[PDB]
Design a protein around this ligand. Sequence first.
Ligand SMILES: Nc1ncnc2c1ncn2[C@@H]1O[C@H](COP(=O)(O)O)[C@@H](O)[C@H]1O
Length: 133
Amino acid sequence: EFNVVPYYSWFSGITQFQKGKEFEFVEGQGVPIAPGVPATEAKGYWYRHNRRSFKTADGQLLPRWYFYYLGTGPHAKDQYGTDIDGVYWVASNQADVNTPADIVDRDPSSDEAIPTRFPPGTVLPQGYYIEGS
Ligand SMILES: Nc1ncnc2c1ncn2[C@@H]1O[C@H](COP(=O)(O)O)[C@@H](O)[C@H]1O
């Protein structure tokens, strides 16, 4: 949850459930599927939301990552592929990463998030759960 309204991702998040496993994709992979989007526009980044829990007298949420098309979201101005903590860049090999994706953001009610799905052959990062799946 957010005490500051986030930029809305077109897609459901990917949640870490095993500590220690790194968030990664093979180069050319990792852009979630949206109907009608040309592969030339399949470029962007996953952004890590660190989550924080409140203290109890019991006994820790792990991060959840959200996808943003290139030139959108909280890192809209950062260059593709730049080392930034909490940003993981992904792109189809059809995409030119020197230009922002031609994709207006999501919301209001207008559209709900698309459950995150990847094409056959995608190496899925172990230790992460794709929300919606
Ligand atoms: N920065 C964000 N933080 C939390 N939720 C977001 C964010 N951007 C968009 N959303 C939408 O809120 C829902 C949470 O994602 P998920 O719970 O993993 O299914 C998703 O449908 C998101 O796309």
